[PDB]
């Protein structure tokens, strides 16, 4: 079983992958399959239960709700087991929003400084795994009443637009932008999306696997085109891959 | 200790009681304790962690997401274990939307089969345990945009007229019902506030929190003016006390 690691900020990202990586290439969530991940080997906080989807001979751990701090404590303690051959993670991914800090390549090489790492294309390459970073939102959402804050909601935010949601609206966003005295930031207009889908559910996380699951069978060639323009699909295809 | 079970449909509702039961009466949630409830008394399902809020000498036991189907299986063990003098439980508050199926009272009647019952105080008295049948969302939210659906939603978007979110908007829901072609759900009403709250969490029962929580500190008495007018207070003052 090859293992990958996949670490995310918080739901509404794991969410985002966890639909994805599902409904679009067939990934399936670990059995009864409960093993208490040592923190002495993988670094996580107690008490934490990852989420692990498997297809064929590959296993994606993916967590979240890490921390500003935490993050640099997994990757230090994979690597360190992986150096004693006490893993076999042969992938780390680290995506967050662009408007976070600074940029997520230097960030997490950051976190690698005592170590020898060698660069490719988008792939850090050390102790035989590759750690792939990458920022979530590089993309521009044309919107007239929408701060541009390159992150997740602006690439749901995006994938509305072209779903022609935003237009059906506009009178809204105008409406909304006036009444709060100040442009929508792209969590505002996710809260939009779930008025126009007449969503009940308690959180956003959960619009997402909803929305995204069935646009997959309603018109797959749109959502395909959606994470092709935001560039999400090599990203994803190195996931699976 | 004196134990009291609050049933409750899902997190949103949780929330909501919590933060009134804690910021408001002083209760605390236990401690790191984590008293594994036996099903074989309380009758929840398997890995179930309800939540456990005390204050003095009383207990609240908080469950939800439990089942339409397993609320009278809980209710059968809870009531089993008491008579055999297995549980100190003296109360039980089942609370439901208005809206969903027929009157509340009947709800829980139906569920108390082969049992001796009279009622008290509006309360169902049966093995010695006052079990209270609540329907939330009983009042009228006077808004020309929005339906008048009787439910937690509703109740919360009342506050969010005497607070006078509602008005600061108007606009926004005169837009958002034209855009989606029919009035707005008091839920819909939810995801506005989210927005003029300028909030950024996945989850709306986090919202509740927050939003109750701030309340207190800066406007102690329109909350409490707002739980009296849709008659929350006789509840919550049988719940402590």
Redesign the interface.
């Given at each position: 079983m090859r293992i990958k690691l996949i670490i995310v900020e918080?739901?509404?990202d794991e969410s985002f992958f966890k639909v994805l990586l599902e409904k679009l290439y067939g990934f399936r969530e670990a059995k009864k399959l409960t093993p208490e991940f040592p923190i002495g080997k993988w670094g996580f906080r107690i008490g934490e239960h990852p989420l692990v989807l498997e297809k064929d001979n590959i296993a994606l751990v993916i967590i979240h709700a890490e921390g500003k701090q935490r993050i640099p404590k997994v990757l230090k303690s994979v690597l360190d087991s992986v150096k004693l051959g006490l893993l076999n993670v042969e992938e780390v991914y680290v995506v967050r929003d662009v408007d976070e800090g600074n940029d997520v390549f230097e960030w997490v090489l950051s976190f690698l400084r005592e170590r020898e790492v060698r660069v490719d294309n988008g792939a850090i390459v050390t102790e035989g795994v590759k750690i792939y970073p990458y920022g979530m939102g590089n993309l521009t959402l044309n919107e007239p009443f929408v701060k541009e804050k390159k992150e997740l909601e602006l690439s749901l935010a995006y994938l509305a637009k072209l779903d022609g949601i935003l237009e059906?609206?506009?009178?809204?966003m105008?409406?909304?932008s006036?009444?709060?005295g100040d442009k929508?930031?792209p969590?505002?207009v996710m809260?939009?999306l779930?008025?126009?889908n007449?969503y009940?559910g308690?959180?956003?996380?959960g619009l997402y696997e909803k929305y995204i699951g069935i646009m997959i069978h309603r018109n797959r060639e749109l959502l395909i085109r959606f994470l092709s323009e935001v560039n999400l699909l090599p990203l994803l295809e190195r996931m699976v891959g």
């Amino acid at each position: 079983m090859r293992i990958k690691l996949i670490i995310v900020e918080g739901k509404t990202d794991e969410s985002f992958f966890k639909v994805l990586l599902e409904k679009l290439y067939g990934f399936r969530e670990a059995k009864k399959l409960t093993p208490e991940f040592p923190i002495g080997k993988w670094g996580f906080r107690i008490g934490e239960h990852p989420l692990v989807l498997e297809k064929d001979n590959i296993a994606l751990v993916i967590i979240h709700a890490e921390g500003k701090q935490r993050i640099p404590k997994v990757l230090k303690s994979v690597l360190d087991s992986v150096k004693l051959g006490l893993l076999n993670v042969e992938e780390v991914y680290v995506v967050r929003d662009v408007d976070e800090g600074n940029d997520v390549f230097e960030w997490v090489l950051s976190f690698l400084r005592e170590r020898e790492v060698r660069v490719d294309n988008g792939a850090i390459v050390t102790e035989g795994v590759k750690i792939y970073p990458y920022g979530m939102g590089n993309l521009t959402l044309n919107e007239p009443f929408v701060k541009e804050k390159k992150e997740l909601e602006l690439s749901l935010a995006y994938l509305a637009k072209l779903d022609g949601i935003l237009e059906k609206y506009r009178g809204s966003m105008r409406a909304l932008s006036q009444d709060k005295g100040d442009k929508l930031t792209p969590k505002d207009v996710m809260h939009i999306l779930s008025i126009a889908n007449d969503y009940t559910g308690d959180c956003l996380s959960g619009l997402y696997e909803k929305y995204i699951g069935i646009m997959i069978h309603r018109n797959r060639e749109l959502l395909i085109r959606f994470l092709s323009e935001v560039n999400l699909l090599p990203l994803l295809e190195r996931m699976v891959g």
